[PDB]
XYZ file of C-alpha atoms in Angstrom:
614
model
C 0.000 0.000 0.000
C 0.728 3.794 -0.227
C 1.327 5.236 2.980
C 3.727 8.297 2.573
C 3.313 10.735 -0.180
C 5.673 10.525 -2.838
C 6.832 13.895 -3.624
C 7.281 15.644 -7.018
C 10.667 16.453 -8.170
C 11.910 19.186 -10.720
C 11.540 17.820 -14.229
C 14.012 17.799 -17.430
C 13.478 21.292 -19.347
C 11.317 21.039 -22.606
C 11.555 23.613 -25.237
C 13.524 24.586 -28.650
C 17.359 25.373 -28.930
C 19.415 27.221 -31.908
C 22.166 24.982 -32.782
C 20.881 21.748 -34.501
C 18.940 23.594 -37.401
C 21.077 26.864 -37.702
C 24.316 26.385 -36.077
C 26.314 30.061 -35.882
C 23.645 31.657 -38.369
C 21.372 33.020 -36.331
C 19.972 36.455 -35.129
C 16.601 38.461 -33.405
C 14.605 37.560 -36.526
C 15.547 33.833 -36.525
C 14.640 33.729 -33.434
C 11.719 35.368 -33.580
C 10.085 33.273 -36.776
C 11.073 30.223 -34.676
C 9.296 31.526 -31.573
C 6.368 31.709 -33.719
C 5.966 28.673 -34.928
C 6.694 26.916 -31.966
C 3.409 28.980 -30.358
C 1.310 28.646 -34.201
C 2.175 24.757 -33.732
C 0.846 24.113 -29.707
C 4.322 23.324 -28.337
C 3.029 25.456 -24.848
C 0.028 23.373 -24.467
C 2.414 20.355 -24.324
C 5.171 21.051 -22.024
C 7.180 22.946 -24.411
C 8.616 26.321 -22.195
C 12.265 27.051 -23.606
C 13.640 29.172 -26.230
C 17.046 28.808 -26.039
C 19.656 30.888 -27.922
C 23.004 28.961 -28.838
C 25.970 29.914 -30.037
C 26.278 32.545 -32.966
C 24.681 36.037 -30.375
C 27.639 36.811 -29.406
C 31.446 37.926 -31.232
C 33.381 38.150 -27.952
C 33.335 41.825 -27.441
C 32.795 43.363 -23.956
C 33.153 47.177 -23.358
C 36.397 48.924 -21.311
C 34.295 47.768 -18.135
C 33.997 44.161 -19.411
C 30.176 44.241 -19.861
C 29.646 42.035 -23.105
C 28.346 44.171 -25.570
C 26.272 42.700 -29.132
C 25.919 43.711 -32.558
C 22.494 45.613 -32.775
C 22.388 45.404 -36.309
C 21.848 41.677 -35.298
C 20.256 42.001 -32.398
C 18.438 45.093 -32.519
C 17.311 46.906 -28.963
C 19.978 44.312 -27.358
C 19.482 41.155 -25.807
C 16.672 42.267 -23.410
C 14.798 42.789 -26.649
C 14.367 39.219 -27.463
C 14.166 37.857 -23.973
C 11.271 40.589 -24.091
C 9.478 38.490 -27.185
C 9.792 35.490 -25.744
C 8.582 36.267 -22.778
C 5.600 37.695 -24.122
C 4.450 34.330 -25.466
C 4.774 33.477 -21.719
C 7.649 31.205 -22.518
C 11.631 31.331 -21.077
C 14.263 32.354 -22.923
C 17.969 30.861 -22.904
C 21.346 31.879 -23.660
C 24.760 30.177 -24.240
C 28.136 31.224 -23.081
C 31.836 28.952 -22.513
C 33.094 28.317 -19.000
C 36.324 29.427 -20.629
C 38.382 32.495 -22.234
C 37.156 31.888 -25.125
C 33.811 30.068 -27.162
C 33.182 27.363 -29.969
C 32.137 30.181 -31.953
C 36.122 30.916 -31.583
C 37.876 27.455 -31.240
C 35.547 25.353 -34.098
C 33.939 28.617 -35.967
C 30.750 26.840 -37.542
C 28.798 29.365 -39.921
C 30.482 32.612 -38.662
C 33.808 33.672 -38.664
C 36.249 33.034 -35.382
C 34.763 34.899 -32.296
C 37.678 35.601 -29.882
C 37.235 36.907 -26.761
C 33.349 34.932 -26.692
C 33.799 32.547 -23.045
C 32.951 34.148 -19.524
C 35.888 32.787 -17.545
C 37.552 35.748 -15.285
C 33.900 37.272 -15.731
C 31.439 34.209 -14.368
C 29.152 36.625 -11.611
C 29.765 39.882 -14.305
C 28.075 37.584 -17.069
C 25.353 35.970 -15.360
C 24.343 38.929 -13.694
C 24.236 40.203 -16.697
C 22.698 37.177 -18.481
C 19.457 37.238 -16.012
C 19.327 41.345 -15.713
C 18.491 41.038 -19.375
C 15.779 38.587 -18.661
C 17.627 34.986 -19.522
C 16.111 32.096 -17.631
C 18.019 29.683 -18.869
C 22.397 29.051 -19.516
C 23.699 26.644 -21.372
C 27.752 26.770 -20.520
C 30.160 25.025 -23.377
C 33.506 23.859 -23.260
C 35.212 24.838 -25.646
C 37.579 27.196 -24.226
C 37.808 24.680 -20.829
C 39.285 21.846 -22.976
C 41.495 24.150 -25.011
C 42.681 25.683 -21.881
C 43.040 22.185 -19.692
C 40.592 23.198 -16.576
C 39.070 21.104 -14.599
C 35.823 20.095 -15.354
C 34.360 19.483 -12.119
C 35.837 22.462 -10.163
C 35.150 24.818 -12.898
C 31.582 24.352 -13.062
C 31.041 24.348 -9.304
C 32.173 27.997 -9.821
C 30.058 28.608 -12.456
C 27.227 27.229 -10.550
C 27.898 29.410 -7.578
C 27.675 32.394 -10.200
C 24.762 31.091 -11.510
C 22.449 30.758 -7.758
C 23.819 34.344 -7.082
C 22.714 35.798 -10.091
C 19.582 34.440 -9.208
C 19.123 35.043 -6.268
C 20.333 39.222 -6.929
C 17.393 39.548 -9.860
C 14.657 36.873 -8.385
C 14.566 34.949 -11.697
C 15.185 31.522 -11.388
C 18.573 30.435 -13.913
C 18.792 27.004 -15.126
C 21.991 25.783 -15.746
C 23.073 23.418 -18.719
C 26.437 21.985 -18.107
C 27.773 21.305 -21.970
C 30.961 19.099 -21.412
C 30.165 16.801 -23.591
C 30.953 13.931 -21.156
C 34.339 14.248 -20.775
C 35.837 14.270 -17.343
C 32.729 11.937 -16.366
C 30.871 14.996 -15.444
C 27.722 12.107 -14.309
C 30.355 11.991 -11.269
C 29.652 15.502 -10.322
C 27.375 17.657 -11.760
C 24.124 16.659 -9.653
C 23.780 19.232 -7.367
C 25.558 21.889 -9.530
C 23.184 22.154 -12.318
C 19.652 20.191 -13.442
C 21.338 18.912 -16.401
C 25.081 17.969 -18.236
C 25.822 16.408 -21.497
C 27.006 13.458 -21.047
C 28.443 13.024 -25.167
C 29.646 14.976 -27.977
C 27.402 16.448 -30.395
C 23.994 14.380 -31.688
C 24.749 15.761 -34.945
C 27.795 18.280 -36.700
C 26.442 20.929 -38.958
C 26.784 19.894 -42.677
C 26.092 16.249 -41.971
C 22.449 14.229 -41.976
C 21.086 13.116 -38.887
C 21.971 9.824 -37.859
C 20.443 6.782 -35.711
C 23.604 5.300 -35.188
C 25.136 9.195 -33.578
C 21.338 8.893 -31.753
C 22.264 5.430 -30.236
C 25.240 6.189 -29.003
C 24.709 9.280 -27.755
C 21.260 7.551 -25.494
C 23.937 4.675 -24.803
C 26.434 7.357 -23.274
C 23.535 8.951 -21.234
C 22.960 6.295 -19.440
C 24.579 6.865 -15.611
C 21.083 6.027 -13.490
C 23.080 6.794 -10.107
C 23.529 10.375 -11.352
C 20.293 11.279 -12.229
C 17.591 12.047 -9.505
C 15.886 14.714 -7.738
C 15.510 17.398 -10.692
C 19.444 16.271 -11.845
C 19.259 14.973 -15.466
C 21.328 13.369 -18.074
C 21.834 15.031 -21.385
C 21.646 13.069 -24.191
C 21.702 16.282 -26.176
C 19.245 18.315 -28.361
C 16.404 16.472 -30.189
C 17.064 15.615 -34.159
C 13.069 14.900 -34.135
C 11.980 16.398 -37.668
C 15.152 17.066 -38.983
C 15.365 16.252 -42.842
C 16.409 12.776 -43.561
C 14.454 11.422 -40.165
C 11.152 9.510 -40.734
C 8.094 9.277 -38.856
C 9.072 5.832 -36.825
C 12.613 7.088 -36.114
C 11.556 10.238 -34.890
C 8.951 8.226 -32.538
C 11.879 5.939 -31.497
C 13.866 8.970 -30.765
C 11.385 10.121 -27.954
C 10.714 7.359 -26.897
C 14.503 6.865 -26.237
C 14.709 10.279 -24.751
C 11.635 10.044 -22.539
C 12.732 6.388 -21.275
C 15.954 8.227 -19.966
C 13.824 11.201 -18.565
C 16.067 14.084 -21.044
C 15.526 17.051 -21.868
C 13.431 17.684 -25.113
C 15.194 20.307 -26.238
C 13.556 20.848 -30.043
C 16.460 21.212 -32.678
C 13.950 21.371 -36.220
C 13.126 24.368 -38.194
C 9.800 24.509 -36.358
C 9.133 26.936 -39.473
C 8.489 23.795 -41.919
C 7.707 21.362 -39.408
C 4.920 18.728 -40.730
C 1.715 18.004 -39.028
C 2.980 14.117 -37.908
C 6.056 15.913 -36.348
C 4.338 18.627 -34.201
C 1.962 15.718 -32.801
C 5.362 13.365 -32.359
C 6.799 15.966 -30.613
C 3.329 16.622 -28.509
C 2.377 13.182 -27.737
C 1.006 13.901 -24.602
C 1.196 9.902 -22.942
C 4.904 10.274 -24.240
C 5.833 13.333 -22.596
C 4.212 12.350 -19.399
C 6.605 9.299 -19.044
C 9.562 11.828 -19.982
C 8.521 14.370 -17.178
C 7.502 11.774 -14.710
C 7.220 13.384 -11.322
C 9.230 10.631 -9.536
C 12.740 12.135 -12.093
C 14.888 8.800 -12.760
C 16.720 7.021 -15.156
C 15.052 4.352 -16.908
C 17.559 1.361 -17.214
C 18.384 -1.773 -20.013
C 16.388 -4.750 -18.398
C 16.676 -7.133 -20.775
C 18.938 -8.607 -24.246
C 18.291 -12.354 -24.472
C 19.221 -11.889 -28.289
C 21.627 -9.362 -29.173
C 20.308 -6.280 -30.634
C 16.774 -7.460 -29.153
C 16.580 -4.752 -26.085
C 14.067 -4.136 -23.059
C 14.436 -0.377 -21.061
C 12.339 -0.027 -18.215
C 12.218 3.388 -16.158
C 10.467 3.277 -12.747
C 7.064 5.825 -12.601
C 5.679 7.409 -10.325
C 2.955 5.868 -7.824
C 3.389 1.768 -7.521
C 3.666 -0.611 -9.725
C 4.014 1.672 -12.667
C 6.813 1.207 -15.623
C 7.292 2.484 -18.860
C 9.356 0.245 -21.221
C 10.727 0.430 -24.951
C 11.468 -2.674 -26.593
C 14.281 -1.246 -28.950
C 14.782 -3.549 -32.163
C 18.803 -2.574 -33.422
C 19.068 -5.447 -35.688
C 18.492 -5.598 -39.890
C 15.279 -8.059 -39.290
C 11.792 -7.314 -37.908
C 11.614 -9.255 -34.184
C 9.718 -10.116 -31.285
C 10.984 -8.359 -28.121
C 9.630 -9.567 -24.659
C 9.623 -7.697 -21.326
C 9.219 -9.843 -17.973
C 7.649 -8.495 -15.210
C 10.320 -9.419 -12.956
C 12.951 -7.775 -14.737
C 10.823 -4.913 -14.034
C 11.015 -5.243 -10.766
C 7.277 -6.337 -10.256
C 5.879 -9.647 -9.298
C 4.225 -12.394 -11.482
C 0.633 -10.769 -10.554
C -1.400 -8.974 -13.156
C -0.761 -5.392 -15.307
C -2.110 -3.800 -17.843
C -0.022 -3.138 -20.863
C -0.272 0.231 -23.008
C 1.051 0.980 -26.153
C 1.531 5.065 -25.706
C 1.714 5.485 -29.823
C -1.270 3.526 -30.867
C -3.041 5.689 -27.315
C -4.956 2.109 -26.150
C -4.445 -0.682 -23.902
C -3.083 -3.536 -25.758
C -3.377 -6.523 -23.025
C -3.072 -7.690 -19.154
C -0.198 -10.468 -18.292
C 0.508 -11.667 -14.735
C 4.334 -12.507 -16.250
C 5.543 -10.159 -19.190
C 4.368 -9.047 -22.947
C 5.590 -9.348 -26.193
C 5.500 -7.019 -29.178
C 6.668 -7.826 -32.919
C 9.329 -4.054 -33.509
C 10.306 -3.203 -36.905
C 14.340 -3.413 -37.580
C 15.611 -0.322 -35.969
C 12.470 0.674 -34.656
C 10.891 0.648 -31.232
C 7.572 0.101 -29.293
C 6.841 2.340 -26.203
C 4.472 1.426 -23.357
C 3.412 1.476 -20.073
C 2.841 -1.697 -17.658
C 0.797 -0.612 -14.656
C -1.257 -1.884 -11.878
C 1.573 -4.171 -11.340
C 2.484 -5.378 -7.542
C 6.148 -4.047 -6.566
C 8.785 -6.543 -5.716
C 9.130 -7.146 -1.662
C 11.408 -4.301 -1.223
C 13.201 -4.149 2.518
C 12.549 -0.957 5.236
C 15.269 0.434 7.282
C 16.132 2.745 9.965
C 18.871 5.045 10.719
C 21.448 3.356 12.861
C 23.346 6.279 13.331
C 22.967 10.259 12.573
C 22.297 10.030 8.614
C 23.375 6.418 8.397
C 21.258 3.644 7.114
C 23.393 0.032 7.228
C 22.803 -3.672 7.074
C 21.122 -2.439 3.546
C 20.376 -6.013 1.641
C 20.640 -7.028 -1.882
C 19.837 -10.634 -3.173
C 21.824 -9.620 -6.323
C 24.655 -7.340 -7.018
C 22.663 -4.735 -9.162
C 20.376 -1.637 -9.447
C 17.960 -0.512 -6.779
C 15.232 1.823 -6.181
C 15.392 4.127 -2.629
C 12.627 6.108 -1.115
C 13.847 7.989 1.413
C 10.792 9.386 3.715
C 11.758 12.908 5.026
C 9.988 16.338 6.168
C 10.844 19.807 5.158
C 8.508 21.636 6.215
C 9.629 25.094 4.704
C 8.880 26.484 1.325
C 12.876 25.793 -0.430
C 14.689 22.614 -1.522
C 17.433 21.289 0.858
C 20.301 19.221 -0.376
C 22.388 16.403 0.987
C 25.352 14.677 -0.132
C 24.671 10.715 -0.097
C 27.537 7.601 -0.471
C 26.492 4.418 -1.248
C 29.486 2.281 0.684
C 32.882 3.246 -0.838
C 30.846 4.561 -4.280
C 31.183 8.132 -5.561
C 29.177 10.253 -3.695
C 26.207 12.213 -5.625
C 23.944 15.393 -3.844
C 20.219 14.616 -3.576
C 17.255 17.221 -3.638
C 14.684 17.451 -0.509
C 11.654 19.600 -2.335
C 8.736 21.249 0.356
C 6.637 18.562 1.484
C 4.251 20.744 4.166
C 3.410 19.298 7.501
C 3.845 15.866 6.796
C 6.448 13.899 5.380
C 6.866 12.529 2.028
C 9.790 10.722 0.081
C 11.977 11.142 -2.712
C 13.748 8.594 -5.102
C 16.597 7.487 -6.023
C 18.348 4.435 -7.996
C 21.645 3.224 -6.310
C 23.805 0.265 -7.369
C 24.170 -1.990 -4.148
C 26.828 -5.310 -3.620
C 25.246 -8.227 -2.967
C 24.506 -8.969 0.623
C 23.620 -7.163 3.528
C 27.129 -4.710 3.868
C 25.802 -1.941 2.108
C 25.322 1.394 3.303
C 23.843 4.345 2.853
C 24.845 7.841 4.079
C 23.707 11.297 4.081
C 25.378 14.458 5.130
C 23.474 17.371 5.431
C 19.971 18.115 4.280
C 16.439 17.459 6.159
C 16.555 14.622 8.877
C 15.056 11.393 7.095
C 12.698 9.120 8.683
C 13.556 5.754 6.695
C 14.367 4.318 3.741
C 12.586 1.870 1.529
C 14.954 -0.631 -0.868
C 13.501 -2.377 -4.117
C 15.498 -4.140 -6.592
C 15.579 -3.844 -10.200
C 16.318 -7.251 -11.114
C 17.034 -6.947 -15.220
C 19.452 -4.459 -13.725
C 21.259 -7.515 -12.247
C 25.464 -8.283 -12.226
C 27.660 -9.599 -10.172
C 31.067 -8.414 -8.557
C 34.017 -10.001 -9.947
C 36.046 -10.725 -6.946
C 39.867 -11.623 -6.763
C 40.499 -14.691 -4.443
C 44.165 -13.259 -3.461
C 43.350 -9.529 -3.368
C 39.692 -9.725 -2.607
C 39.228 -6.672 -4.089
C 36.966 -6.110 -7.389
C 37.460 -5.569 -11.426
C 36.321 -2.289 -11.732
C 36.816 0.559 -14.516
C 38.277 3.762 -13.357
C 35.727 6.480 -11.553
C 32.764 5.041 -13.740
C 34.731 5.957 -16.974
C 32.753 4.457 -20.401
C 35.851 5.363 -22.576
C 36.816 1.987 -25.347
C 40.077 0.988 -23.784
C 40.308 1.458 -20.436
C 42.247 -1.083 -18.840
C 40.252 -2.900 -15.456
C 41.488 -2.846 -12.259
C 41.327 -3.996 -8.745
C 40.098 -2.173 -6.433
C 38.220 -1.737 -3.080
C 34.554 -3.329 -3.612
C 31.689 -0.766 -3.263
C 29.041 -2.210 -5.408
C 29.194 0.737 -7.965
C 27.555 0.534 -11.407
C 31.486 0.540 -12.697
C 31.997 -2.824 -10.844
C 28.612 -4.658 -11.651
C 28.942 -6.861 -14.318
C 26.131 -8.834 -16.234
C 27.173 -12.484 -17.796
C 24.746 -12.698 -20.781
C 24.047 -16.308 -22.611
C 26.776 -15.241 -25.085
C 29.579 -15.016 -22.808
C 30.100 -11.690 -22.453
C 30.637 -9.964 -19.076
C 29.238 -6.893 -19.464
C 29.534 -3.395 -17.909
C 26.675 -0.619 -17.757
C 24.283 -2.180 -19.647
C 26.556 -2.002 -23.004
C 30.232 -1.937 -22.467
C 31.936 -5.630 -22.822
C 35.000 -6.587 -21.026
C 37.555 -6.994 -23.974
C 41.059 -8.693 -24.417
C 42.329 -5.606 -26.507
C 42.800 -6.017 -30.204
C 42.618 -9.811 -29.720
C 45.383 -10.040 -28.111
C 46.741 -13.938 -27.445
C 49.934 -13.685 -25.526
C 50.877 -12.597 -22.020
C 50.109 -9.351 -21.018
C 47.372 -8.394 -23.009
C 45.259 -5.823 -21.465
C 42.090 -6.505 -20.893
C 39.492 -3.265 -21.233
C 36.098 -2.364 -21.654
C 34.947 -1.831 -25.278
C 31.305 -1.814 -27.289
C 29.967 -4.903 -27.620
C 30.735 -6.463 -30.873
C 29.873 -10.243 -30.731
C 33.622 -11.259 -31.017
C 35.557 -14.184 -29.306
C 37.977 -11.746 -27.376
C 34.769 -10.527 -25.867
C 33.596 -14.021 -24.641
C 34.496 -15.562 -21.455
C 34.316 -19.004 -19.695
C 33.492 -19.200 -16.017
C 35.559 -22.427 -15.033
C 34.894 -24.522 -11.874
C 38.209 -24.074 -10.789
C 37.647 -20.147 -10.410
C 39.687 -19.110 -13.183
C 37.925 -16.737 -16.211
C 38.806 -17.614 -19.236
C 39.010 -15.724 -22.807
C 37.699 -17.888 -25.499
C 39.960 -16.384 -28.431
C 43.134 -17.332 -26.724
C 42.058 -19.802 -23.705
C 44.069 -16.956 -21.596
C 43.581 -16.457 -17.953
C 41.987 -12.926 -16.458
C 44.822 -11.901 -14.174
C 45.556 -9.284 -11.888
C 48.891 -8.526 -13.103
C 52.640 -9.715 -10.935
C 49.645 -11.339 -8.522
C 49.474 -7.796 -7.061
C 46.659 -6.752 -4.811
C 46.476 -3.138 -4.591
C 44.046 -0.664 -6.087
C 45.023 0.142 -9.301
C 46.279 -3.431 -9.982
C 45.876 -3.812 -13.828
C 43.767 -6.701 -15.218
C 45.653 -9.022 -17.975
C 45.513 -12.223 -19.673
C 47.951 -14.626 -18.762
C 48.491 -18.347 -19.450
C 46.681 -19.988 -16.590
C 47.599 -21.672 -14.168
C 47.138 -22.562 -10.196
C 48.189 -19.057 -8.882
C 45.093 -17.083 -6.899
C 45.596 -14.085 -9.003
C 43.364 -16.267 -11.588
C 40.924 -17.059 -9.613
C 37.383 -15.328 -9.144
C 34.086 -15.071 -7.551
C 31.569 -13.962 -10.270
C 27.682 -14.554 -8.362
């Protein structure tokens, strides 16, 4: 039963952005057509509340006092001007900037010529002052002049966030903060709690070239860090390609559908100008949008590949017993995709099963449904009415401490942590799962009476995990649910008894495993599919590097590509075997530190070969 409130967390922001139709070329009448035809075609009705402004406003200049000063001839009345216009369609309007010296629009000039001088580092609390004075309500921060200039990621955009909340905070209008990093540095590490959302790829699409399923895949394949993303903190797959010229109807369905599974932003990229009648109502599918901007704000998750290619993502709802699924078909050949209930997480008792393009109820099942999905298409729908898996209950054992947390599988689980704040602002806290990365959670008002918030946390099999929070609102429990599709296990060194694990939850091809302490993080969970593959996030495989046969060869993560390096044996003897080579996994001179590199190595009765992998 339902017995404390669940309460509603900040959703992904929905609107249009610049770049994807008109890269550097744009100006106050571009703008200003495209605001109009976003109103003409009912995007407000259906979520739709951003007009953001990318790169191409702004040449670098700044007067003697550092104010940055536009081209009126461009951008006639100023900046204020257009925030004005948008504005008075009751929409928000969004501007773009570099966390360094210098822009894209200087370092990779696309459509204009090279704008020095165009990033706000040395100026971060001048500029977004100055950014929300003119009415912006909404920052998208690039990284252009960061990477060119070797910052740090992490630090540099906790100072821009602090610029950001005091800009704020001085004018009264809310800023929202895009982090655009373009994954590198593994800003899913550390943005949550600086900003609502961060890309977590390069670009969806480069200006010249045709949009692409394949750059779509990948980039809803990189976006997938569920442990980040809670609480009104989003991955960013990037901006949507849906109506772009070359896309058809289905792929620009299974393009939201991928979106809204992960809960990203739908950030419009089209020339809403010339936009047809089937993509305005793709883009304002109402059941569709409603799983994207589900109140509960987390990551839907791969639950299932018994064939290769043949995919099941599930994303938790909110209420009980609620899912949304896409059964993604990646193959050349038309297939039947199943989801199981308890992959989901639910128990073999009866759903109902909607399909959210067709708009009806398609069946009820007490154990899973299966659709036939087009090759390279997709089916979205909702399962609910379902009963929730067990779950366990805990309470504190200490100030902010929650242990003796229990998993029956090393894997993905869903917490509901029951708290009051009783005031009319969002508190934070910072919460570590065992040894993981920590990540900040969001407390939203929840009156009088207490309510809960979610989020998913990977957990070691057992009952050793814990669960700690610093700061925030005192909680008054925690609930624990496991996502069973989400299920791996901890490869565990007999001699060290430490962990194969992949550096600070880096998804890079080539990085070499490790040892190192086990904490149950999504970077040491791996899945051992029916083809012999040990896999890592959902879709990383661990690798014996360019086939390698002989001593030494490092062994890496690396996209799955149905080879025999990427197949492994599980022997009785509690060695892991390669199939290309018959190799040993090996942590490397039988050391047993952190950091101890992961190798093949002709096996033999050393416990530097040997494993625990349940």
């Amino acid at each position: 039963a339902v017995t404390t409130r669940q309460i509603t967390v900040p959703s992904a922001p929905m609107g249009w952005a610049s770049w994807n139709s008109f890269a550097a070329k744009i100006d106050y009448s571009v703008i200003k057509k495209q605001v109009d035809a976003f109103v003409a075609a009912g995007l407000p009705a259906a979520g739709y509340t951003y007009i953001n402004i990318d790169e191409g406003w702004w040449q670098g200049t700044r007067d003697s006092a550092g104010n940055i000063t536009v081209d009126t001839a461009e951008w006639p009345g100023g900046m204020s001007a257009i925030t004005a216009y948008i504005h008075s369609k009751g929409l928000k309007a969004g501007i773009y900037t570099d966390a360094g010296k210098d822009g894209c629009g200087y370092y990779y000039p696309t459509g204009r010529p090279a704008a020095p001088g165009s990033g706000s580092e040395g100026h971060y609390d001048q500029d977004m002052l100055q950014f929300s004075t003119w009415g912006f309500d909404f920052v998208k921060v690039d990284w252009c002049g960061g990477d060119a200039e070797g910052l740090d990621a992490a630090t540099t955009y906790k100072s821009i966030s602090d610029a950001v909340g005091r800009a704020a905070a001085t004018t009264g209008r809310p800023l929202t903060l895009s982090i655009c990093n373009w994954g590198y540095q593994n800003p899913w590490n550390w943005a949550a709690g600086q900003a609502p959302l961060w890309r977590t790829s390069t670009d969806i699409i480069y200006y010249g070239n045709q949009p692409s399923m394949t750059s779509l895949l990948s980039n809803f394949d990189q976006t997938l860090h569920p442990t980040a993303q809670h609480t009104g903190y989003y991955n960013d797959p990037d901006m949507l390609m849906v109506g772009m010229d070359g896309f058809t109807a289905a792929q620009n369905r299974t393009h939201m559908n991928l979106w809204a599974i992960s809960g990203a932003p739908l950030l419009a990229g089209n020339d809403l100008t010339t936009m047809t009648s089937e993509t305005a109502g793709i883009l304002k599918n109402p059941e569709v949008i409603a799983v994207d901007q589900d109140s509960r704000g987390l990551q839907g998750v791969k639950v299932a590949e018994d064939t290769t290619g043949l995919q099941a993502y599930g994303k938790v709802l909110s209420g009980t017993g609620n899912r949304a699924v896409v059964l993604l078909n990646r193959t050349s050949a038309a297939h039947d995709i199943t989801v199981r209930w308890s992959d989901l997480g639910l128990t073999n008792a009866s759903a109902t099963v909607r399909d959210l393009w067709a708009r009806q109820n398609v069946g009820t099942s007490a154990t899973g449904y299966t659709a036939s999905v087009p090759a390279g298409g997709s089916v979205m729908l909702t399962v609910t009415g379902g009963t929730e898996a067990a779950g366990g209950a805990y309470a504190a054992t200490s100030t902010g401490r929650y242990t003796g947390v229990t998993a029956a599988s090393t894997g993905l689980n869903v917490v509901d942590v029951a708290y009051t704040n009783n005031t009319s602002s969002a508190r934070t806290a910072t919460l570590q799962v065992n040894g993981q990365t920590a990540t900040t959670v969001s407390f939203p008002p929840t009156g009088a009476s207490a309510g809960t918030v979610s989020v998913e946390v990977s957990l070691s099999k057992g009952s050793a995990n814990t669960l700690a929070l610093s700061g925030g609102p005192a909680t008054e429990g925690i609930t624990v649910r496991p996502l069973p599709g989400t299920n791996g296990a901890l490869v565990t060194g007999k001699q060290s008894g430490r962990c194969a694990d992949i550096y600070n939850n880096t998804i890079t091809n080539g990085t070499q495993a490790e040892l190192w302490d086990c904490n149950g993080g999504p970077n040491q969970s791996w899945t051992y599919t029916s083809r012999k593959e040990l896999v890592l996030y959902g879709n990383k495989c661990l690798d014996a590097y360019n086939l390698g046969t002989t001593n030494g060869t490092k062994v890496v993560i690396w996209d799955c590509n149905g080879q025999a390096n990427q197949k492994w044996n599980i022997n009785s003897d509690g060695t892991i075997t390669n199939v290309n080579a018959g190799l040993c996994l090996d942590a490397y001179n039988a050391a047993t530190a952190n950091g101890t590199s992961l190798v093949l190595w002709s096996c033999g009765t050393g416990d530097n070969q040997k494993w625990t992998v349940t």
